[PDB]
Amino acid sequence: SINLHSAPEYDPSYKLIQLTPELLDIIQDPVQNHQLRFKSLDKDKSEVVLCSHDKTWVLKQRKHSNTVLLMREFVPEQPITFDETLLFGLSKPYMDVVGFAKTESEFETRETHGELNLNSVIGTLEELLENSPCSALEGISKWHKIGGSCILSQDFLFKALHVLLMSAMAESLDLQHLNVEDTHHAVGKDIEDEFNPYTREIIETVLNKFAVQTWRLRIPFIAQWYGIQALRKYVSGISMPIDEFLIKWKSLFPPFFPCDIDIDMLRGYHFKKTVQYIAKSTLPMDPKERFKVLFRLQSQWDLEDIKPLIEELNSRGMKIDSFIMKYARRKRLGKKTVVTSR
Amino acid sequence: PSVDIDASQWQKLTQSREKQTTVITPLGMMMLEIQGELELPKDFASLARRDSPNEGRFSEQDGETLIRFGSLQIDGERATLFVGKKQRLLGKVTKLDVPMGIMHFNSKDNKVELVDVMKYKVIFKDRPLPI
């Protein structure tokens, strides 16, 4: 049998954490230690997550009514001798264990998602991904998505995109391979440093915003983005017919690099034989009222023009056609399945 | 703040020790679970002086006075727990669907270290019987 011993005081530093098969494999990986990390925002309010290089799990504590005592094997300093009066049911004791901790709760891990904390000097990016409920990859992706550097405003980030394109085309920079040094030298070549806010960090920020890493060119992303800005500058006030506004919008362009148009690019940021700008974050966040106001805006909608306008709204995760038939009602035709509501 | 999980020692010890045979983990660790409150004396030091050779209820290990409070007998999945001199509890060794990781939170350095993994548990859900 096993002799059972208990310490008069247990260490509360030991804590039980639940092990998923994926975490069970990451931990049982002898090739790379320190692959999991307990991240969180602050020191008294925010939740706690465990992140790898690409995933995230939230912690959840569950208390139970049982006595859960952790035991370890030790070597007796002196031989454990005692009279065993019971003769039936007990074998000769060959091992001794002691209770070192007493857990009255378990800590569960369930996969989750992360956001950034843009409250505040932080200094470096590791300290921002430090005090932020998020992982590593999601954090750098969102930091590239928001044009952070501090955080560049829209006007400055897009004047920097324009000046960057002008300088890159003026020096005939290679489209296939670009680095921060060549572009930064191309921007501040004939201008002084006191009036040159476009430092190397700003260049890397504009790159990571309008491209991914050399930084490969995301042509559709940049061209469509510029078109959305033109929409914000022209039809943010007045609506206009489709043709004349297509002319006046197409008239605005970046410098030398060309841009192709498509029915897909001209979709998701305006509404209709008319056309006027519209934004997604300004619609009422309630689904039924959102579809109500959208139906109140256009008597008739297009499939390609409304499909990106509704994918981010409903968080059910169901199929697209189900989403469409759901809070509304279809009415297809020959060319494309359009929609109306009474 | 944030701190990494140190699993180097647990990995070295797992790789260097043999495969799990019984409910006891390869690191020489087990879990006992009791549906109840374990009533132990509040003053071990006083009773350790009153300990007689026949009882053998207390011993010294690394400066800590340990009490010998029971015996455990594992018969396959079936388990029987003797507590004190007068209690017998019937229970089972059951595999937890989600394994649990023991993590030591060293408050001094705010460091967390992987200690061991549960790997089954000996649970006792039935009323204790006479010996």
Binding site: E47, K60 | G36, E39
Partner: peptide
């Protein structure tokens, strides 16, 4: 020395975790 037997077993509803729950 004895065990005070609980007649049955209950696990409470899972709860969220804050930073202070881990570092008490």
């Amino acid at each position: 020395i004895w065990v005070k037997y609980n007649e049955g077993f209950s696990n409470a509803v899972r709860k969220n975790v804050t930073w202070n729950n881990l570092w008490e």
